[PDB]
Design a protein around this nucleic acid. Sequence first.
DNA 1: GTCGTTAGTTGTGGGACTAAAGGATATCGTGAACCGAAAAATTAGTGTAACGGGTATCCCACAACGCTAG
Length: 50
Amino acid sequence: SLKGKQGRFRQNLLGKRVDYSARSVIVVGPEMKLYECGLPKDMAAELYKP
DNA sequence: GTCGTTAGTTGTGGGACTAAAGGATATCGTGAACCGAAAAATTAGTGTAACGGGTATCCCACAACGCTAG
């Protein structure tokens, strides 16, 4: 249980699944700024819920 | 001639092998018979109505005047 990629150290201590996280496909926004990103409304509403 | 030593194999054993998503499975073979355990179902037995004063509360209606004479 303590050994390997799926072991405790490398699966639950050195890297963790986290809250306030999301995932989606990426499209290109050419009219945006270098420090900007476009978040979908549902993703932002779920992430910023508190 | 014989015994311990050193280095170079040689065979054998233990330990590594991106990151992201997802994530459904199927799983044989049979020997008997009696006793004990507890969990469940079935059966057997008892019953009020108004009254006296006296007084606590409720709803429900009404009152809570005006004038004259000795």
